[PDB]
Write a protein that binds this ligand. Structure first.
Ligand SMILES: *C(=N)[C@H](C[C@@H]1CCNC1=O)NC(=O)[C@@H]1[C@@H]2[C@H](CN1C(=O)[C@@H](NC(=O)C(F)(F)F)C(C)(C)C)C2(C)C
Ligand SMILES: *C(=N)[C@H](C[C@@H]1CCNC1=O)NC(=O)[C@@H]1[C@@H]2[C@H](CN1C(=O)[C@@H](NC(=O)C(F)(F)F)C(C)(C)C)C2(C)C
Lengths: 305, 301
């Protein structure tokens, strides 16, 4: 028993992290086969980050302008190209540690593990959710850029996130591994703000299931609700609408606990109205929304990689 | 910016995890050079669990009674010895993935990462703290035994915990890597209860210092306290007594913020007195006690 914010094992991704230097800018790169991926803003000088012309800056640089270090070994860059907001450096050597991998774009509410790195060196791993406003509540200091988010499914690493920037509100913004930003952000030192966030309702319900599975039952009540009645109340409290998709996805947990989803919706509705009345759920005084249904079944079933 | 409960990268420990089987019992082992370390209770049957005579069970074992399996490879056991509650299997292959390592015994309030494993395969990694009552609030199912807790310092892995059992309150007990239990627990399936748990006061203060560094001051007050008056109040909320040692440890955070340790103690008294009144500190509506003074300086500016 027990319930923790649990990250994927980072071993396969630690094998891929390199240091990328262009002039005075150092940050992190992802070395897969004979390409290194990193944020395109590595080419920017102080003056440039305000209104950079990336295509302009890029064409003016020789391969030797990119210093790529895998531990003590310098990699020789034999090509460079842009793809949206990620720079792709072609190197002479395939990464012998390249895992089975895929680039995947994730939906809001979906969780991943972040491997925080500094000078191409893995520092820490944590579990995140893509917020509905396309930000992540990360922990990133100077030099964190190029740090990646991933999921594992058997032996396949799904890279979903590369870190680019921090928003003034202390939350974080980045791209998929094809350089497409998550959310309405641009890689420029101009002023940007995260939209107002909402709570991932399907994730809160999965976390209440995890509570019941661990013997925390006090919030269960005799009632049932409907999606409409639940969703009408939910919107009020800035809660994502619960779609029928969501109700089907909880089916395993519902069947495994004996608590039907629309019964659990009535328990969550009451929690939104009255709060938790000086009580905790799994030692939390807040309603936790960074666990997916699949995260709950995986931790509670002991799925390995 | 940001403040996350963060674990160490698990790669160096993943490289060391194996499956250890003895009779019908399978759990996880830790393979370092030519020794596999695992919980000695791998040699128990069902019946053996209440009053196992470990010395009696072990003399009856051959090296070839132990199946060790690193991925496909079955390792060959060329020696077995017990040390306290840890079985040590000598094998004929040094682990090539062996990192720089050392074994360390941690004190209550110290944090570490856990690589939860089943059948020598990792399920996931999370961050923990040795509770004052010498338990951990882990996430551990059947077959999790031999999963380890660790810290990483540059490229050196400090192993500090190996998992052995779950107490009736749903909390976890285990040993250092020399096989000595943390706390008064024994590797028998006998009635055992955790002592009443307390909050790790020094960690909460560190976390309040973290909140200030991250720019939140709402909970500061114009008061100070004596160490003694602080502890008299704190204990009424089941907080660990704060020692002069704890005060010395908090020195650097005190300096960085310019807030005296005993002023920060004054804020905690008030918070204990008032709660948070719909507010949060670093995104928590509870006071966080699983960040050490060291963890805060490591993760903050
Ligand atoms: C990459 N190593 C850093 C990571 C930062 C450092 C502090 N926390 C992080 O996540 N990324 C950057 O320096 C990017 C980079 C220019 C500006 N930038 C920022 O993160 C800045 N943010 C913004 O300009 C804002 F708010 F508009 F999003 C900063 C103010 C320094 C936090 C570029 C090219 C976007
Ligand atoms: C190792 N794979 C398990 C890990 C357990 C299983 C459930 N969650 C865990 O952390 N270890 C054990 O099964 C140990 C083992 C015998 C009994 N045991 C227990 O964890 C049991 N608890 C106790 O005996 C108690 F309460 F005293 F700690 C159990 C009832 C199965 C939870 C030995 C040798 C202690």
């Amino acid at each position: 028993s027990g319930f923790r914010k649990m990250a994927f094992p980072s071993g396969k991704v630690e094998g891929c992290m390199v240091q990328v230097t262009c002039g005075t800018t150092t940050l992190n790169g992802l070395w897969l086969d004979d390409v290194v991926y990193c944020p395109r803003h590595v080419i920017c000088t102080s003056e440039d980050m305000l209104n950079p012309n990336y295509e302009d800056l890029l064409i003016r640089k020789s391969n030797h302008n990119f210093l790529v270090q895998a531990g003590n070994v310098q990699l020789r860059v034999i090509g460079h190209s842009m793809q949206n907001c990620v720079l792709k450096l072609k190197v002479d050597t395939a990464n012998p540690k390249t895992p089975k991998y895929k680039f995947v774009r994730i939906q809001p509410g979906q969780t991943f593990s972040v491997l925080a790195c500094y000078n191409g060196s893995p520092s820490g791993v944590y579990q995140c959710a893509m917020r509905p406003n396309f930000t992540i509540k990360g922990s990133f200091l100077n030099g964190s850029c190029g740090s990646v988010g991933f999921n594992i499914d058997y032996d396949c690493v799904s890279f979903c996130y590369m870190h680019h920037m921090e928003l003034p509100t202390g939350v974080h913004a980045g791209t998929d591994l094809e350089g497409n930003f998550y959310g309405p952000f641009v890689d420029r030192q101009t002023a940007q703000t995260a939209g107002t966030d909402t709570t991932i309702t399907v994730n809160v319900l999965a976390w209440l299931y995890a509570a019941v599975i661990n013997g925390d039952r006090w919030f269960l009540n005799r009632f049932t609700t409907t999606l409409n009645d639940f969703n009408l109340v939910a919107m009020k409290y800035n809660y994502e609408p619960l779609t029928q998709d969501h109700v089907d996805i909880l089916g395993p947990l519902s069947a495994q606990t004996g608590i039907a989803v629309l019964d659990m919706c009535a328990s969550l509705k009451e929690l939104l109205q009255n709060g938790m009345n000086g009580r905790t759920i799994l030692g939390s005084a807040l309603l936790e929304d960074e666990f997916t249904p699949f995260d709950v079944v995986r931790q509670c079933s002991g799925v390995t990689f």
